[PDB]
Design a binder for this molecule. Structure first.
Ligand code: SF4
Ligand code: SF4
Ligand code: SF4
Ligand code: SF4
Ligand code: FES
Ligand code: NA
Ligand SMILES: [Zn+2]
Lengths: 95, 125, 114, 106, 688, 51, 83, 47, 208
């Protein structure tokens, strides 16, 4: 989430934040640090794992041609989920 | 009608280049080494002339890479080692040449993988 | 080592064209200074002319001296006809540029450059 | 639609940009994902050619329909990643419908 | 006089018998498409991408394996050849994943590039694709095996170059999968080279992952200093930052491989860096200061002491342009205590004759010997690419290999004569049973490791081995142009230091402790503030804060090897130079210009102001330090031996145990290796 | 190998994705040669001499 | 105060033939005479043979050995080692 | 939109924001990466 | 018939070969090479001494009448000794054909000016001199045309950097536009795009 540093500056989702003694903090005086508050890492973790029967499942991200290139994920390693390398959705085999 | 000019060719005074970037610059005449992630050898035929790397620093505003070197992206291409030396000579750049590294010819033999009694017998296909 | 001449057949016949260009540049400083309303003195302008002619004091190939003379006439013409401006004439005087020290220590303190 | 960024730091928008207007850096994320830590468009180098829109394989970078974003300083026209994601969230309702109206011509 | 004649599209070629169709086309300049074939691996012949039409034959031969027969016309571009390539490329891509945007190969993928040049532009595959589960084979090599094209280059490399028969293919048919079946880590000092030889993104570098694309990067052709082999490398940089180290091809040194330390330790260049001159304030703590201030302290102290009171130690990563610079400075205050952390016996000839402390047979000479005797050394870790060249001769030329030392694992089989260095006495006499082999050897090669000369009885061992070789040179009747005596160094600056006349070892400083010590990148911890006079002025010039820095009075931030054009001399004595990839960070400065800046403040200005003039000075000292890429032959070994028979020192009975027994001790040896978070994972990986 | 494929194919076919990747990074190679092309542009002969 | 002697020479150019004979006949005896002195022999293809002697406080002098003979070389080396 | 509303998303801005140039809300560019070269930290004690 | 490959024609290539032999028979003192590309374009490569005679004959001859100088330009190829290739593209309205006449130059070997043949060339030769520093004899008014006044160098030479050496800003101290050494907040990023695999077997060079 939007953690705040001890200096009081907001930390961006990439972890950047000017030090206490970095002069470059002056650009935000009487202004603001543009920060995007919807951390994609936090949002993707909220999705539930889709369960499927087959051992190989194709993900295109939804929307068909409006998604990402279609890839397949193996589901054999029945201890971790299969993750899409594009959209980050998770899959797990039913049995 | 011809004249005799008993001196090597120097065109530095005509190129409009600051003194800074003629006397302190070292060029490197070389054939590029094959990129080791690929097998193609088509980028290993021509000779290149590149200039010594100079400082790059981080832009205070954005972190981009700033430069005060005007010759950082200069890359001349030549067909022969001799053409590249002549070009550097008539321009006054001190050059440094490296000889072409060709792959030495090797002895291949599929039938060596099954040797009745040599260590080249592979244990797996 | 035989080559077509441009204009001069050897350095002595080329220096004749050099001095003739230096004369013309010398006669024109008092006008450039007067017409362009430059904030310099004639002596200071003429010294700068001499300084640029001595920047190429090492040239010996006669063909090269032909093309420096050819260029210098083009530069003279750009000034006599007032195609150049104060900014252009004043660029020869590098008035805003701090000059890089020529001693090792000062270079060493200032950065990685040689 | 889940809120995950589409951009996977492939850098094809960067390789095509006629103006060298896009700067990108990337690294593995905390969850291992391939994502950008930097993404800049110097909107004063951009020629608004839309080539990055064509090169992107996952529709991550687009040119929205906004044209009324003139500023009072040059520095405000150097967009970093936060600014561009904020424009994405600001304009998504309208961007999504324009792609829906045009992707079949692409 | 057996060069058959073949035709490539009509043009005639005279090739040796045994040349293949693919090698025949190399000569007329035509390069055949490939995936499975690699010029340094055994021929495999399974990718079928090299199928090429021979005129008048109906079937297509595999260019990479079919031996060429005289009178053949190879049609590298006919319709059959073009159609075979289109069909084969069409199969390779049928089950390949649409991964190019998330793939670290993209932009430098032989599958991408050969699909553009020789394949089709369409897909007529309307089925589902396969997906194979990934394997976790260590912290260096990432596996995404859905991208594997089952070319078995990794299997052949591992088996025959690393000698680690642990990668293989399980399964069969379209389900066939490369890997390890069990869960094993592919840990080896040469394992990172599978990343290069894997033609796709199946095997990629974890440390490098996702960080850059090939077209972005600028390639600087430099040299590697993690060891004394002097591997030629390429340093990719992007926007002033080092991205990855890659091998540059050099047939006579590293061929096309580098050790994992060379490949992956560069990330230690980004931590623990000295970026600012530092001095001690009144509470005894180091504080940042300025160059003019910091040099003003060292000159002030240098103007007092002279002679024995000033000494310098050179570390494991110092350039010849800084050793000669630091030599000239100290010689100008009367001092001669220029020392190096490495020990080398100074009895006998000492460093008088280059032949005494070099690898005289060279790295490519191993390929011609027929016996190798290793004395006190683990070449696998001291010189990983020199052990690679041994196994290659062990494999092809059937090289016999013997080891006087500890029974370390070399990746091939060798005769263990024993560890006691009394065995040198035996073999020289003719008692030891190994002599039955030596009498049958027309090209013996004895390699004595620099790790064995660090012992308290270093001089004795070198004299013994120097004498066991004078019996070999006549027990086998070798020609004058075959060198038998060799020394294997493990430190980059060692050979160039000895070339310039540094005293090997810090023993002189123990004899006459200095009141001013110059630690020029020294970090071995040999001389500590308990070996030195109370309140001694120590100046540390380096590029990492490790061991030398925290004990220094003054710290002078120097460049690293990636950050300067520097000269290094490898174990053969070959001189080669690095190149600037990035510039030094912060206020760091090139190492030879700090000593030149220092010399002018202290009133003893040195006569050189540019890199050109400093190398001209290197010439004046040892003129082979400017002969770049050149092996200079050296003779006069007979003289060094005759001076070695008089040394009255005798060999102790300690077993010869090398400092590195297992891959655990390989990863972190010098300052940069120790600043690397990737090497820490590798250490933690093999340990646990 | 010259004109990029459709986006729908780029996201389905492995040949189409590769060709998309190379066309939008390296671009296509043009065979060596020179041409002088001219058209009747609204102002007059507008020519390109391309090498 | 002599501190170091350096001998330069080619391995196969006859201009240095005299120097090579000096090395083989006299170096072993000369070294035993001065076990402590550093005498550096640094061969290099196609150099001009030279003899660099470094004295105290970095003072260096070069006697050129081109086209001498063993006897004429040992005299030049004896000049440096003595005075 | 009163008849064809846009698809709802949890990240779409609820509150529009007009041109904030010249105001204290104005965007200010900066580098979103973290430090690259880490410097050595000297010991805090005498030797 | 292939709906993707350009129609090849036939007659035009044969016609331009006949005229290429024609030109070479008549001007054997100047013609060094004649070729016709697969695009079907005739090229005459002449010794630079032959420029004025060669363009005069091609303009005034009755079976030529190449009366329009479509353009004149140079190409910089540093590997060649005569690094400047001068190209004349001529147009014949009488015969509805085109022809390319090429000669060469170096840094210190000026070409004759064809202003006496084609007035169109007057500014074209100013542009070659400005951008490549190729001097022309007998030009009525040879002076820069495209670069800023007092600009030093020839920016279309391959060894001239893309961003140049100097840049301009306004300096309020001296109250005028000043020139200073170039420093870029962001450096132009050079991309290595060449594929290591050969794309055209037909242009492969012998490895001799
Ligand atoms: S629209 Fe702008 S950012 Fe996108 S490719 Fe074109 S110039 Fe680059
Ligand atoms: S915006 Fe698109 S093209 Fe650009 S890096 Fe991200 S995924 Fe690639
Ligand atoms: S290896 Fe990677 S870049 Fe190459 S074709 Fe496969 S997915 Fe694309
Ligand atoms: S992992 Fe790579 S090298 Fe090994 S078989 Fe697969 S494609 Fe070939
Ligand atoms: S390269 Fe010959 S079959 Fe693979
Ligand atoms: Na790989
Ligand atoms: Zn997905």
């Amino acid at each position: 989430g939007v953690q705040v540093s001890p200096s009081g500056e907001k930390i961006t989702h990439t972890g950047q934040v000017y030090d206490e003694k970095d002069y470059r903090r002056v650009r935000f005086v009487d202004r603001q640090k543009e920060v995007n508050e919807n951390f994609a890492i936090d949002l993707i973790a909220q999705q539930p794992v889709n369960e499927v029967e087959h051992r190989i499942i194709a993900c295109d991200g939804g929307g068909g041609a409006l998604g990402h290139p279609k890839v397949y994920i193996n589901l054999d390693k029945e201890t971790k989920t299969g993750t899409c390398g594009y959209c980050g959705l998770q899959f797990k085999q039913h049995h | 009608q011809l004249i005799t000019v008993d001196e090597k060719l120097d065109i530095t005074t005509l190129t409009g280049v600051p003194e800074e970037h003629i006397k302190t610059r070292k060029v490197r005449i070389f054939v590029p080494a094959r990129n080791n992630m690929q097998s193609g050898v088509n980028n290993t035929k021509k000779w290149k002339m590149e200039f010594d790397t100079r400082e790059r620093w981080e832009n205070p505003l954005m972190g981009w890479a700033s430069t005060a070197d005007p010759l950082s992206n200069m890359v001349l291409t030549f067909s022969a080692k001799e053409d590249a030396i002549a070009f550097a000579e008539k321009n006054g750049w001190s050059y440094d040449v490296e000889e072409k590294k060709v792959p030495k010819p090797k002895s291949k033999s599929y039938g060596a993988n099954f040797s009745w009694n040599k260590r080249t017998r592979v244990s797996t296909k | 080592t035989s080559v077509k001449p441009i204009f001069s057949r050897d350095l002595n016949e080329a220096k004749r064209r050099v001095r003739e260009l230096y004369r013309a540049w010398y006669r024109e400083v008092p006008n450039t200074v007067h017409l362009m309303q430059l904030d310099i003195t004639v002596k200071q302008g003429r010294d700068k002319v001499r300084e640029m002619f001595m920047k190429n004091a090492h040239v010996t190939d006669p063909r090269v001296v032909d093309l420096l003379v050819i260029k210098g006439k083009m530069e003279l013409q750009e000034t006599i006809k007032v195609w150049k401006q104060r900014t252009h004439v004043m660029r020869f005087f590098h008035e805003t540029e701090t000059p890089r020290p020529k001693d090792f220590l000062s270079k060493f303190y200032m950065g990685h450059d040689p | 639609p889940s809120g995950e960024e589409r951009c996977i730091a492939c850098k094809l928008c960067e390789a095509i940009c006629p103006a060298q207007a896009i700067t990108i850096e990337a690294e593995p994320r905390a969850d291992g994902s391939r994502r950008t830590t930097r993404y800049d468009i110097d909107m004063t180098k951009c020629i608004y050619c839309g080539f990055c829109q064509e090169a992107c394989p996952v529709d991550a970078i687009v040119e929205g329909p906004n044209f009324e974003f003139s500023t009072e300083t040059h520095e405000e026209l150097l967009y970093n990643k936060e600014k561009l994601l904020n424009n994405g969230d600001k304009w998504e309702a309208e961007i999504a419908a324009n792609i829906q109206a045009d992707y079949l011509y692409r | 006089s057996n060069l058959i004649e073949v035709f490539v599209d009509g043009q005639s070629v005279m090739v040796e018998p045994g040349t293949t169709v693919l090698q025949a086309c190399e000569k007329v300049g035509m390069q055949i498409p490939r995936f499975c074939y690699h010029e340094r691996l055994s021929v495999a012949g399974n990718c079928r991408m090299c199928l090429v039409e021979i005129e008048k034959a109906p079937k297509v031969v595999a260019a990479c394996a079919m031996p060429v027969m005289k009178g053949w016309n190879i049609l590298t571009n006919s319709e059959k050849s073009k159609k075979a390539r289109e069909g084969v490329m069409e199969f390779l891509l049928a089950n390949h994943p649409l991964d190019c945007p998330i793939c670290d190969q993209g932009g430098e993928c032989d599958l991408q590039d050969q699909s553009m040049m020789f394949g089709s532009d369409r897909s007529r595959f309307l089925e589902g694709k396969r997906a194979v589960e990934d394997k976790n084979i260590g912290p260096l090599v990432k596996t995404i095996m859905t991208r594997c094209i089952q070319c078995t280059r990794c299997i052949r490399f591992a088996s025959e170059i690393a000698g680690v028969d642990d990668l293989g293919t399980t399964g069969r048919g379209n389900d066939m999968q490369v890997g390890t079946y069990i869960e094993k880590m592919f840990m080896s000092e040469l394992s990172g080279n599978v990343i290069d030889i894997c033609p796709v993104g199946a095997l990629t570098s974890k440390p490098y992952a996702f960080t850059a694309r090939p077209w972005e990067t600028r390639k600087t052709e430099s040299i590697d200093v993690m060891d004394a082999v002097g591997s030629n490398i390429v340093v990719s940089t992007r926007t002033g930052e080092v991205m990855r180290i890659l091998p540059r091809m050099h047939e006579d040194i590293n061929e096309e491989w580098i050790s994992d330390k060379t490949r992956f330790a560069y990330d230690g260049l980004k931590r623990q860096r000295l970026t600012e001159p530092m001095v001690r304030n009144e509470k005894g703590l180091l504080t940042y200061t300025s160059w003019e201030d910091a040099l003003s302290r060292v000159a002030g102290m240098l103007q007092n002491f002279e002679g024995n009171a000033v000494a310098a130690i050179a570390g494991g990563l110092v350039d010849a342009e800084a050793l000669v610079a630091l030599k000239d400075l100290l010689n100008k205050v009367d001092s001669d205590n220029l020392c190096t952390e490495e020990i080398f016996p100074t009895e006998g000839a000492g460093t008088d004759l280059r032949s005494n402390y070099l690898l005289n047979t060279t790295i490519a000479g191993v390929e011609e010997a027929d016996v190798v005797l290793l004395v006190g050394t683990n070449p696998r870790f001291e010189a990983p690419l020199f052990n690679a060249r041994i196994r290659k001769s062990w494999l092809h030329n059937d090289l016999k290999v013997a080891l006087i030392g500890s029974p370390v694992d070399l990746t091939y089989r060798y005769d263990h004569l024993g560890d006691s260095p009394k065995i040198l006495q035996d073999i020289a006499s003719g008692r030891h049973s190994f002599c039955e082999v030596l009498k049958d050897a027309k090209k013996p090669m004895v390699v004595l490791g620099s790790s064995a000369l660090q012992r308290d009885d270093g001089a004795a061992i070198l004299v013994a081995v120097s004498n066991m070789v004078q019996k070999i040179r006549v027990t086998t009747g070798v020609a004058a142009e075959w060198k038998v005596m060799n020394i294997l160094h493990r430190i980059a600056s060692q050979v160039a230091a000895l070339d310039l006349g540094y005293k090997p070892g810090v023993e002189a400083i123990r004899k006459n402790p200095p009141k001013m010590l110059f630690l020029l990148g020294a970090d071995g911890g040999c001389i500590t503030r308990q070996d030195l006079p109370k309140d001694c002025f120590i100046v540390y010039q380096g590029h990492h804060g490790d061991v030398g820095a925290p004990m220094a009075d003054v710290i002078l931030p120097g460049a690293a090897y990636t950050e300067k054009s520097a000269t290094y001399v490898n174990t053969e004595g070959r001189a080669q130079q690095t190149k600037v990839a990035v510039t030094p960070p912060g206020l760091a400065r090139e190492d030879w210009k700090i000593i030149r800046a220092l010399s002018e403040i202290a009133g003893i200005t040195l006569p050189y102001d540019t890199l050109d003039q400093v190398r001209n000075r290197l010439e004046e000292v040892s003129p082979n330090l400017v002969r770049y890429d050149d092996i200079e032959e050296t003779n006069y070994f007979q003289q060094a031996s005759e001076l070695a028979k008089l040394v009255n020192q005798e060999v102790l009975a300690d077993p010869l145990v090398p400092p590195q027994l297992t891959i655990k001790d390989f990863y972190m040896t010098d300052s940069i290796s120790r600043a690397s978070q990737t090497m820490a994972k590798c250490v933690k990986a093999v340990t646990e | 190998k010259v004109s990029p494929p459709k986006r729908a194919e780029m996201k389905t076919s492995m040949e189409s994705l590769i060709h998309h990747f190379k066309l939008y990074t390296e671009g296509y190679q043009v065979p060596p040669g020179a041409t002088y092309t001219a058209i009747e542009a609204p102002k007059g002969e507008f020519g390109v001499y391309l090498v | 105060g002599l501190r170091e002697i350096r001998v330069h020479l080619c391995q196969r150019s006859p201009g240095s033939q005299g120097v090579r004979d000096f090395i083989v006949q006299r170096y072993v005896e000369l070294k035993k005479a001065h076990p402590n002195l550093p005498i550096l022999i640094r061969e290099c293809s196609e150099v001009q043979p030279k003899l660099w002697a470094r004295y105290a406080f970095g003072q260096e002098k070069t006697v050129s050995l081109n086209n001498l003979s063993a006897d004429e070389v040992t005299r030049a080396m004896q000049n440096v080692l003595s005075g | 939109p009163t008849t064809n509303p846009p698809t709802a998303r949890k990240f779409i801005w609820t509150n529009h924001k007009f041109n904030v140039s010249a105001t204290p809300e104005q965007y200010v560019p900066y580098s979103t990466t973290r430090k690259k070269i880490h410097e050595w930290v000297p010991p805090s004690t005498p030797y | 018939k292939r709906p993707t490959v350009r129609p090849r024609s036939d007659v035009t290539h044969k016609q331009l070969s006949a005229f290429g032999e024609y030109v070479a028979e008549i001007l054997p003192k100047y013609v060094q090479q004649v070729q016709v590309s697969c695009l079907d374009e005739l090229e005459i490569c002449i010794h630079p001494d032959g420029v004025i005679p060669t363009l005069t004959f091609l303009r005034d001859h009755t079976n030529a009448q190449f009366k329009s100088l479509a353009d004149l330009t140079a190409v910089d190829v540093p590997t060649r000794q005569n690094r400047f290739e001068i190209v004349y593209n001529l147009l014949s309205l009488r015969f509805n054909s085109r022809i390319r006449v090429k000669t060469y130059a170096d840094e210190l070997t000026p070409i004759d000016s064809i202003v006496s043949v084609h007035i169109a060339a007057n500014w074209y030769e100013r542009e070659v001199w400005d951008m490549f520093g190729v001097f022309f004899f007998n030009h009525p008014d040879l002076r820069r045309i495209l670069t800023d006044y007092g600009f030093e160098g020839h920016p279309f030479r391959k060894d001239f950097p893309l961003t140049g050496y100097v840049e301009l800003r306004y300096d309020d101290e001296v109250k005028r536009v000043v020139a200073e050494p170039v420093e870029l907040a962001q450096e132009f990023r050079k991309f290595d795009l060449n594929s290591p695999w050969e794309a055209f077997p037909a242009y492969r060079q012998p490895p001799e």
